[PDB]
Design a protein around this ligand. Structure first.
Ligand code: RXF
Ligand code: RXF
Lengths: 349, 349
């Protein structure tokens, strides 16, 4: 069902700061080409979209895209099926979707001069990085190599171009400033639930430690593990005996303990190997990253928490990629998210 | 005023091309940091959002943001009132809103290396340009100088931070490729109406000459005038005796003549001076730019066209900025757009 009844919808900007150019602005002088003279620039602000149903129940959901992505991934699948935005408005939740600072409708901080440079100050780096189609194919576990699908894949085959077109670079905005923008949104919204993805997994955990309004977290395929400072457990290298997973983020235990106060679920798709896989770097990377997360969740539970790991194949769902919420079985994935919300009273007023 | 009922909503990517790096991709080697080796990159694609009401009447509308903007400006005003997207879904049109290539959820073409550079190929320039708050203030005619408002302004005063946060830079993607993406969208949609703004004014005129599915154009404060090649009229320099308006775009007459086959309306807000204003560069720029547009429309009409210029003050609306569709009286501005659609039957099936 594609029908949606909205009590209200819209979008707004929140967060960010300003930086200023030298000198002063004279309205008599030519304004184009643009100049940094007398300039105030708003930087690192975030775009926020909301849709509210009639008669909402439970807490609003904040959907937070993964690395190099935008709120598009919650709007629609690459083959044009409804995304989680529609599904959960239909499930009677108010739904927020964001484009974080540096992505999509969020701000890209650049000026008049080499990319990211304001006179002598580097606001973000001029040198960018960006995944290729090939890198994203194996990162997202469509298959073991570009152009090849796992036999069981839930990916919407035939819509590869549409899928990869949604991805792009991120400028070097500090993670602190990205977290700051979402903390400010959570302050504005009130009690809510964060639903994160890959790169935004660790960022959402950080937000919750700064914002008691976060009443629950569901993280799809989180990319970076988090631990109390000085208590990172032994994590093996990858099967190539050369590479490591992403260095785990370390926070003061007084902040880490806040994660034990809310229900947290990490969700993983399929085709993560059980055993070392030296021929396929990202598959092996996901094996060790998932392992590190299991230990992170265990640490939260030793502090009295309620942190769980859901492998979708254990729930009867086979073949999901690293984007289970846009896969062909996304309605079933959504049902499992509704189950988590219902278990924890997050779908009741 | 806020309730909206959608038969369906969603988003998708369209247009663009691919560029490739050197070499071959090896899935056994570390995928992060990302590399251009063996890489395929999707570049210059466009993001498209659609909202369809139940039982649409008349043609779909394609809202095309101005320079440095995104589809946000059609979603909500800076103070959170409904934008034209909501207003015209309520008016029973299917509504498309785009983020053009290079803006918002559209692609920003950059790779692993200095911004915009793929090995030895410069896809877009590493040196960017971007407006300041101060430049945008006078560009958009909030007032004659930053901090000042014209009397009777319809700007949503107090929401300056929200407003300027929606603006940003555009990489040097060729205008040809931006036009190409929207031609592809118009082919996909079928007969439609383009609603353009400032920088997308001339781009929408170009699309219409390439796409018979464009059945009408309403252009809010277009920034560049368009003429048949070799027949640009005499246009005076600005009052500073030094500057000129944007060089008018010239197209072959065979293509220009296609503009005479559809209704076209240019819409201007308030406070464009009638006489030279040497003290206020952008006010004088708008005076001469609007004059050039009056000549462009007269050229369309001499070829048998249906082109008109609507000054909102002549319709009884005073104080509009260069973004009349997000001003305080935007409902009244919308009513005038509904009037144009009804006059030409573009609101009937
Ligand atoms: C410690 C990080 O260091 C680092 N350095 C560089 N270059 C120096 N690049 C990166 N890139 C990413 O993290 N990519 S990623 O896209 O966010 C991602 C990665 C893994 C798994 C998933 C994702 C993801 O979100 O899939 C949607 N990371
Ligand atoms: C032939 C132009 O050459 C040129 N050169 C440079 N730098 C060398 N910069 C520009 N910038 C713009 O055109 N800005 S603009 O934002 O699109 C714009 C302008 C005027 C009026 C309105 C707008 C606008 O859309 O307001 C939302 N133009």
């Amino acid at each position: 069902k594609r029908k949606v009844v909205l009590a209200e919808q819209g979008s707004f900007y929140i967060g960010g700061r300003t930086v200023t150019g030298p000198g002063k602005f004279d309205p008599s002088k030519p304004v184009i080409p643009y100049s940094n003279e007398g300039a105030t620039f708003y930087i690192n602000q975030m775009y926020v979209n909301f849709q509210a149903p009639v008669r909402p129940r439970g807490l609003p959901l904040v959907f937070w895209h993964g690395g190099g992505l935008t709120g598009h991934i919650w709007e629609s699948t690459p083959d044009g099926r409804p995304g989680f935005q529609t599904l959960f408005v239909q499930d009677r939740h108010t739904v927020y979707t964001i484009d974080q600072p540096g992505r999509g409708r969020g701000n890209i901080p650049t000026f008049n001069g080499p990319f990211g440079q304001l006179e002598e100050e580097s606001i973000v780096n001029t040198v960018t990085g960006n995944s290729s189609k090939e890198g994203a194919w194996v990162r997202d576990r469509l298959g073991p190599a570009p152009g090849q699908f796992f036999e069981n894949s839930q990916f919407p085959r035939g819509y590869e171009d549409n899928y990869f077109k949604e991805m792009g670079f991120s400028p070097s905005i500090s993670s602190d400033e990205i977290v700051d923008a979402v903390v400010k949104l959570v302050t504005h919204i009130g009690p809510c639930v964060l639903v994160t993805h890959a790169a935004s997994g660790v960022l959402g955990m950080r937000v919750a430690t700064h914002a008691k309004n976060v009443r629950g977290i569901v993280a799809y395929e989180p990319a970076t593990s988090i631990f109390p400072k000085g208590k990172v457990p032994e994590i093996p290298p990858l099967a190539d005996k050369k590479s490591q997973i992403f260095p785990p983020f370390e926070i003061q235990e007084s902040y880490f303990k806040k994660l034990a106060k809310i229900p947290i679920q990490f969700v993983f798709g399929d085709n993560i190997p059980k055993n070392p896989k030296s021929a396929y770097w990202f598959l092996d990377w996901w094996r060790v990253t998932r392992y590190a997360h299991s230990l992170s969740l265990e640490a939260i539970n030793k502090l009295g928490g309620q942190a769980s790991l859901l492998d979708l194949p254990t729930a009867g769902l086979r073949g999901n990629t690293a984007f289970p919420f846009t896969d062909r079985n996304n309605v079933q994935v959504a049902s499992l998210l509704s189950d988590f919300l219902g278990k924890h009273g997050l779908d009741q007023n």
